[model samples]
Target: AKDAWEIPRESLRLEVKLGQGCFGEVWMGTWNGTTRVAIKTLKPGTMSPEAFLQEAQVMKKLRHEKLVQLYAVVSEEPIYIVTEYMSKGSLLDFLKGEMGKYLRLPQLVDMAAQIASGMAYVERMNYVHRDLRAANILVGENLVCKVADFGGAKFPIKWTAPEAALYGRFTIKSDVWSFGILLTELTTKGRVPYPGMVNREVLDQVERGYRMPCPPECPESLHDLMCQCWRKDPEERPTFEYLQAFLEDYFTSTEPQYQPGENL
Candidate 1:
């Protein structure tokens, strides 16, 4: 009773080590004899193997153009999770690199738009991405950004909603709150959220109704949208569908100052 998504160990060939993932080492690899993929090797004893496979089952069902696609899962020892190979790597690194320095306003907005598009799909699927920070967003060719690492991660207090930080409540609404921080990171070119503030400070300030101010180059519309996502009341946060549409509208209406690859 093997599932189609279950990949045999012999089918993959690991190439280069990418970096550390949430629970294991991620490597660039090939499937069968061709397709490139990113393989996350699950560390033994991180969690029960049964739970890992269950999480993979959830990932198997989530598919979107703006999401890092899950290709297959290796169920045996040294378990591996295979996903689309995002060539440019994480959004955090991409934004901080030389290429990120020249991002035009439209391109930045487009990045947010793409992420929101993927998140809207997640929302529609009734799945709350416990982790939604910039580091989890991957960049591919043509500067396209796709949401990744939805299986989950350690809670980042700075990106967490007040309700969730305090009461352990996790929902799509809380995800919206994290989206606000992601916007800040993107706007600031991969700067850490709540810069200069430690985790305790962020948690305390957010609980006191504080939100990060606009980055020097942040578009006002995007900042406003971020504020909306940061509303103290989770119910007041905009849905991913609304966020996606709003960002797309912003992107389309704005005239391009720099053509794609003009700055690169």
Candidate 2:
């Protein structure tokens, strides 16, 4: 524990399952005597020891208020990485739950803004989160949000950009496309994107100029921003910095006169 990154095996007492990831199941655990932590234990035979450790090194480097804090790594492979516990769970689950019904638009806007700001930080850090979506977003206390589940996350095709799907090209702009999907997830209160369609069909459609319609009654400003994110050309899509700035302006400017509780 004194090595600055190692968390002892004994200190972590797993309580209940928090969530599942591509490589592991995250558990709610009590560390030592009082600290609650999320322990992400890598599944057996997932990766070589060195590769997983290398991943842990990079994940530990990323520390931001809007990003989940990876507190410590128990070991290299067969990894049990510990992080701060997010009690409120994921935005997708929250959106479908009864809790979402009470959230006003301002709160949702703030949620969207926080996710954008987190991505902005990652962009500045020279990291591209290839798999970005609503399910990857963790909801914390008081409606605060943090972008989570990075490193070995899966690239579910529905949320990927056209270029990414076509050429396996994942860049910051492609992340913007995923951000658009994330926004749509929020607008639709957690409905699955292109619900009944297969990944191949959705990919083909997006390649052919298909885009999901903005959720019924979504604010024009939000819808417009979402549209800006889905532009076919990567260069045409706005950066996370620009998106966050727009969210800031959308709150302060007087152009779009609307109430916070407007159903979207």
Candidate 3:
């Protein structure tokens, strides 16, 4: 029922401004003065109200531990989209930080595995995340990462599969390819895909059978996995389920310090 997710403005108290983009601002907020939340406020003319609510409705139905939970939607003026608070912010920003550099390869792979774990659920639900990238992933307490910002946007060339970029076609396979690029992002500690290459160069080389070379110190198998995601044929790409399994195996094999549930 709509009543489950629709929140009243009076109950939300906005705190610090988290970030802002073309979509508008996100703030750290509290719900009913108790639970913390991330509230996204829409710029009045940015998009259609119906479209925004429709997407939020869909988000409410799609819940997973590794997904940023949608808590509520304030549909009144200055529409607020509320979600689970991620204190650490985006995974991309986290990787770029000094703390993120301290993580070893296995730990990085663990991060990827976590993202895949969430995406695997999305895949099972048969929903294609048109925009899947490190920037769209959020990290909460305990270094827990979750997928966020589904459904949307202009195709990011470097993160996109060739077919999805050239044509407007987006499929779960395309998201798999995006995950491949994201793996590179993790391995390189937040380096942008294609490195110094421009979008045109990336598209050109990718179409001509080019793929990024493995990041230094990155495991060969992980690099191979990235290549698998970039295969010319979308059908040849590993599903999120398979990717999750492979990454988890890699993480567990090389790591003996701690278990998934325990903190070292």
TM-score of every model versus the real structure: 0.90, 0.90, 0.90
Candidate 2, which segments miss by more than 4 Å at Cα?
Answer: 19-24, 43-46, 76-78, 150-155, 254-256, 260-262
TM-score of 2: 0.90
For residues 1-264, write the lDDT of model 3, one tens digit per residue: 446678778899999898777767889989999999988888888877776677788887898999888899888658888988988988898988976768667678878999999999999999988788999999888879999983435558899998899887789999999999999888777889887899889989999999999887666677899999999999999999999988788755543443432211
Compose the digit string of candidate 2's lDDT tens values, residues 1-264.
345889667788999986676677878888885988888787878756676667678777898999988878878556787888888998999998998777666777789889999999999998998878988899988888999865423458898888887788899999999999998888888889988898788977888888877677677778888888999889999999988877767766733676555564
Query: Which clashing pairs does model 2 show?
Result: none
Candidate 1's residue-wise lDDT over 169-203, tens digit each?
Answer: 99999999999999888878888988899988888
